[PDB]
Design a protein around this ligand. Structure first.
Ligand SMILES: *[C@@H]1O[C@H](CO)[C@@H](O[C@@H]2O[C@H](CO)[C@@H](O[C@@H]3O[C@H](CO[C@H]4O[C@H](CO)[C@@H](O)[C@H](O[C@H]5O[C@H](CO)[C@@H](O)[C@H](O)[C@@H]5O)[C@@H]4O)[C@@H](O)[C@H](O[C@H]4O[C@H](CO)[C@@H](O)[C@H](O)[C@@H]4O)[C@@H]3O)[C@H](O)[C@H]2NC(C)=O)[C@H](O)[C@H]1NC(C)=O
Ligand SMILES: *[C@@H]1O[C@H](CO)[C@@H](O)[C@H](O)[C@H]1NC(C)=O
Ligand SMILES: *[C@@H]1O[C@H](CO)[C@@H](O)[C@H](O)[C@H]1NC(C)=O
Ligand SMILES: *[C@@H]1O[C@H](CO)[C@@H](O)[C@H](O)[C@H]1NC(C)=O
Ligand SMILES: *[C@@H]1O[C@H](CO)[C@@H](O)[C@H](O)[C@H]1NC(C)=O
Ligand SMILES: *[C@@H]1O[C@H](CO)[C@@H](O)[C@H](O)[C@H]1NC(C)=O
Ligand SMILES: *[C@@H]1O[C@H](CO)[C@@H](O)[C@H](O)[C@H]1NC(C)=O
Lengths: 112, 128, 123, 123, 123
């Protein structure tokens, strides 16, 4: 592991509650001069784009998901935790003509 | 809104080179870039690069430049808004550090600031 | 110039919305009769369009904003996944059912606009 | 909707002035020739109307206020005893003599309006 | 009135620019066919003019100011030695080469005007 973009390690929640996962790196990958994409990614399988351009969701994404980007970090909140939210989440910094600088993952547990 | 089926699970040994396929269907293959990502047992996810089925353009991360052979076919139109194409992924100096799951990812949009963002993923292929 | 006459037919709606006056220019005895027939038909379809733009308050506009709020029953799609993705031809195949409903919504907003404008200049 | 196409023909001018776009829509070989003839005539009478609305500054209007003060020589009747009593057909039979005089008054006010507007944007 | 229909053909452009609605009014079987042919042709040339005025933002104008700065390559002549000397017919024989170039300049200014106007009403 060598990702320059750190997340909130791991975090947990309970049914009906809301979570939040950080995402921040140095001045070279975050944030006021870079977009941020949030990916739901089960272990070694088919991922899913959740949020691009800091606060825009992908098609069909449930309104529970939300984003926010300050000048030094971006956050992914998961309103109304449902049982199908046990997985790991990664972020990514990018512009129009660059690549996805991924994050260090944040496994989320909904045990309740 | 279409499928991106890839090859099987072909495992070779260091120094060699492996070809990974990525056949499209159900969406205009020329309208969206094709990205290549992987998750190796040793790091997390790593972005490798994308290619344009229309512009023929290539942009990869400097970490995978002098190792990746990335190409595409030319879509076979099914309808006015459908097509079927295929992207190809090869690597040069192969090792056991590169062992992991690989997929292709169709771009998000056709314009704006999030055009190439890997939206639609394939199925995954296990390397060496 | 730009691409030309319909050159952005398979282009994104964002790029296609620019330079719309290229398709606004070129829009207007067995041989003689069948030549004059097409001449009268052309003026008809064109006038039907200007007729609509007139009873919408857009007479003389290429891009014309209105009052009717966009009903999500027509399409629950973002501005982003339309103007930077769908082509103009894809789009109106999706609005095809609701096109004759919006046309009625635009006429009431123009009739109920000058009706209010009439009260405005009474003072 | 409202009553329909001409449905307020015998209605008061006050109620008839509402929803005028219902009569603004439906305004635009022996059989073939006599069918094409009516087609060309229709476009003519319609364009003659839009032509007038253009040289009056009302091009694109359904209700259009102007500058010409209402001369009482045309009719010394109140706004009340017109728009809440007379029907549109009764009214213009009364203005029938003065209709070709007001038409001239509206054109000078549009020509002497853009002539002044020209001086306005010289600064 | 004024002089009449084209009465200021050999008059100065300054006096001719006044009362332009006199030439805006009168602008719109062997005998039958050659009579209907002229009828369809008339509506065409007229609509081609209104078509241009529309894609210039002048739809409904007689005198219409724009944005395009007057290039001196077209004519390095003063406002005085034009509008108080040359007649309208003399003038456009001088601009005859550059007339199809200015026409293109007027359409971009109308397309790049409503494109900006679109951004204006987004707030
Ligand atoms: C037909 O349909 C196809 C597919 O739908 C259209 O092709 C796509 O067009 C869109 C918009 O025009 C492209 O998105 C843009 O991508 C550029 C990235 O280009 C830059 O980076 C490249 C890699 O680093 C680089 O190759 C480019 O360099 C030039 O040279 C190549 C040589 O191949 C040339 O092909 C390029 O065009 C370049 O000229 C370049 O440095 C990105 O920069 C864009 O973002 C900018 O613009 C948007 C507005 O458009 C703005 O919002 C941003 O903020 C930023 O300013 C934009 O993302 C897409 O890459 C194309 N290809 C796909 C989707 O596969 C094509 O245009 C259609 N043609 C017609 C006629 O309809
Ligand atoms: C949307 O349209 C439907 C009919 O198609 C109508 O019943 C509904 O009230 C409309 N909603 C809004 C918010 O306009
Ligand atoms: C329009 O109506 C038809 C009815 O058969 C339906 O099948 C079609 O899906 C509708 N189109 C849209 C865009 O809703
Ligand atoms: C009314 O019209 C007559 C001619 O019909 C005219 O002589 C008179 O000056 C006009 N009066 C007003 C006030 O406009
Ligand atoms: C119009 O003129 C005729 C002339 O015969 C006259 O009889 C009629 O009363 C006039 N109409 C009006 C409304 O003054
Ligand atoms: C004038 O027009 C010429 C072409 O006829 C063009 O090259 C030049 O840039 C123009 N100058 C100005 C000031 O518009
Ligand atoms: C137009 O072009 C012709 C080319 O033969 C030239 O002779 C003429 O002088 C030009 N007219 C003007 C007004 O420059």
């Amino acid at each position: 592991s060598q990702s320059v973009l750190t997340q909130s390690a791991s975090v947990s929640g309970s049914l009906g509650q809301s979570v939040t996962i950080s995402c921040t790196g140095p001045n070279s990958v975050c944030c006021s001069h870079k977009s941020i994409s949030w990916y739901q990614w089960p272990p070694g399988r088919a991922p899913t784009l959740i949020i691009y351009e800091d606060n825009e969701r992908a098609p069909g994404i449930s309104p529970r998901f939300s984003g926010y980007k300050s000048y030094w970090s971006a956050y992914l909140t998961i309103s109304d935790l449902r049982p199908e939210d046990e997985t790991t989440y990664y972020c990514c910094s990018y512009t129009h003509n660059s690549g996805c600088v991924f994050g260090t993952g944040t496994k989320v547990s909904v045990l309740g | 809104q279409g499928q991106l089926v890839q090859s099987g699970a072909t495992t070779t040994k260091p120094g060699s080179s492996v070809k990974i396929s990525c056949k499209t269907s159900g969406y205009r293959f020329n309208f969206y870039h094709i990205n290549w990502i992987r998750q190796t047992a040793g790091r997390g996810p790593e972005w490798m690069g994308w290619i344009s089925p229309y512009s023929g353009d290539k942009n990869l991360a400097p970490a995978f430049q002098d190792r990746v052979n990335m190409t595409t076919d030319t879509e076979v139109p099914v309808t006015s808004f459908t097509s079927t194409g295929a992207a190809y992924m090869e690597i040069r100096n192969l090792t056991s550090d590169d062992t992991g799951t690989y997929f292709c990812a169709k771009g998000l949009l056709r314009d704006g600031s999030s055009t190439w963002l890997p939206y639609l993923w394939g199925q995954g292929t296990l390397l060496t | 110039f730009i691409l030309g006459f319909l050159g952005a037919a398979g282009s994104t709606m964002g790029a296609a919305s620019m330079a719309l006056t290229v398709q606004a220019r070129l829009l207007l005895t067995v041989w003689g009769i069948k030549q004059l027939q097409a001449r009268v038909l052309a003026v008809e379809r064109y006038l039907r369009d200007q007729q609509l733009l007139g009873i919408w308050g857009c007479s003389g506009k290429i891009i014309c904003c209105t009052n009717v709020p966009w009903n999500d029953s027509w399409s629950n799609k973002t501005i982003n996944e339309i103007w930077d993705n769908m082509t103009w031809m894809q789009w109106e195949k999706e609005i095809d059912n609701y096109t004759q409903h919006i046309y009625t919504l635009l006429e009431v907003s123009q009739i109920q606009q000058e009706k209010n404008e009439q009260e405005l200049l009474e003072l």
